[model samples]
Target: MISIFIAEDQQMLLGALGSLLNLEDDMEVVGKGTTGQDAVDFVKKRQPDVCIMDIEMPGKTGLEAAEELKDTGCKIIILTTFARPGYFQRAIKAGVKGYLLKDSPSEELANAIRSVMNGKRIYAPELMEDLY
Candidate 1:
């Protein structure tokens, strides 16, 4: 199973995303956090296979958490509504394995988790423009 951790400040959307991703047979939502620091702490303790983080979370931003956990063997995936060019650049610099939009389909999220778990990088096609 692919152990997953979530760091989203919005409770309703977090639950929805978790529910959608959990529908996949090979994915497991190990924990959820509402802030970047909590996310970093949870992932450090749980050592989940993948961490889905919201870029705009309170405390430390998702990018900051990802940077802190870059050497912990956990793949980072940023899930955000903003597809800002600079954000993608920052994510890449932080060693994020995947970049996805908040409204992306559940299948995309599942695919991203699986890809990253298998040591691959995955990014939403629509966000490709931000990469360059």
Candidate 2:
């Protein structure tokens, strides 16, 4: 199974997402948090295969957390409502493996997790560019 950690501030969305991802036969929601610091701490302790994170959060932003966790070798996916160019650029610089819009289909999220675990980077088509 592909172990996963989710760091989203909204409790309802976090719970729903965790449940949804867990439904995938090849995925497991191993940990979850509402803040970016929580993400760093949890991942450092548990070291899940992938981390699904939101850009805006208390303590630290997802981009900041990703930079801090870069050496940990746990892939990060930026799952956020923002599509700002600055955020996308920062995520890339931090070596984030995925950049997906929150409104994308739920199935896409699962596929993204699987893809990143397999050493592939995935992004919402709307965030298109020649960077790939």
Candidate 3:
């Protein structure tokens, strides 16, 4: 199973995603956090295989958390509602393995987790057009 750590501030969406991803046979949510710092702390404790993070969160931003945990052997995936160009750029620079929009289909999210686990990078197709 692919152990996952989710860091999303919105409680409802976070539970929804946990339920959705859990439906996949190969995926399991090992931990969840509402703030970026909590995410960092959780990952340090749980050492999950992948971390799905929201760009915006209380305390620290996802980017900051990703930077802090970059060397932790955990794959970072930024799943955010904001499609801002700057966020994408920074996510890339921070060594994020996947960048996805929150509205992306559950299948896309599953594929992203699988891809990242296989040592591949993933991003929303819509965001691809903005890549220079």
Candidate 4:
């Protein structure tokens, strides 16, 4: 199974996602954090196969946490609403493996985790739709 951790700023949403994503056939929701620093700490300790990180949080921005967690050997997928080039640029520089929009279909999130684990990069096609 592909172990995964989710870090989102809202406890309600974070808990909701954990339960839903856990239903994925190949994924196990190992843990979750309601803040960015918590995410960094949890992943550093648990070292899950993938981390699904929301871009803005109380302690550190997802991009900041991604940079801090780069050496932990966990694939990071950035989840955001902005879909801004600046954030995407920072994520790429920090070695993030995926950049996905929060509004994406639930299945797409699971696919992103699998894709990043398999040595591929995924950017939300919706985000790409606007970039051009």
- The estimated TM-scores of all candidates read 0.79, 0.80, 0.79, 0.81
Q: List the residue pairs that clash in candidate 1.
A: none
- Model 4 stretches astray by more than 4 angstroms: 8-10, 33-39, 58-62, 125-132
lDDT by residue for model 3 (37-56), tens? 66667778779898877666
- The most accurate candidate by TM-score is 4
Candidate 2 residue pairs in clash (backbone atoms < 3 Å) = none
Q: How large is the C-alpha RMSD of every model relative to the true structure?
A: 2.9, 3.4, 3.0, 2.9
Can you write out model 1's per-residue Cα lDDT over 21-125, one digit (the tens) per residue?
A: 878888888765445566667777889888777776656554676677777778988877756667767777788899888787778788888888888999776
Worst 10 residues of 1 by lDDT: 31-40
TM-score of 2: 0.80
Per-residue error at 107 for model 1, in Å?
0.8
Q: Which regions of candidate 2 fall more than 4 Å away from where they truly are?
A: 8-10, 33-39, 58-62, 128-132
Between prediction 1 and prediction 3, the one with superior lDDT is 3
Worst 10 residues of 2 by lDDT: 123-132
Query: Model 1 compared with the native: what TM-score?
Result: 0.79
What does candidate 4's lDDT look like per residue over 9-110, in tens digits?
357886788789889788888755435566667777888998777776666564776677778888988877765556666777788899888878988888
lDDT (tens digit, per residue) of candidate 2 on 1-132: 998877653477677888888889998887654455665677788888887766666565547756677777789888776566566677778889998887889888888888888889997767644332
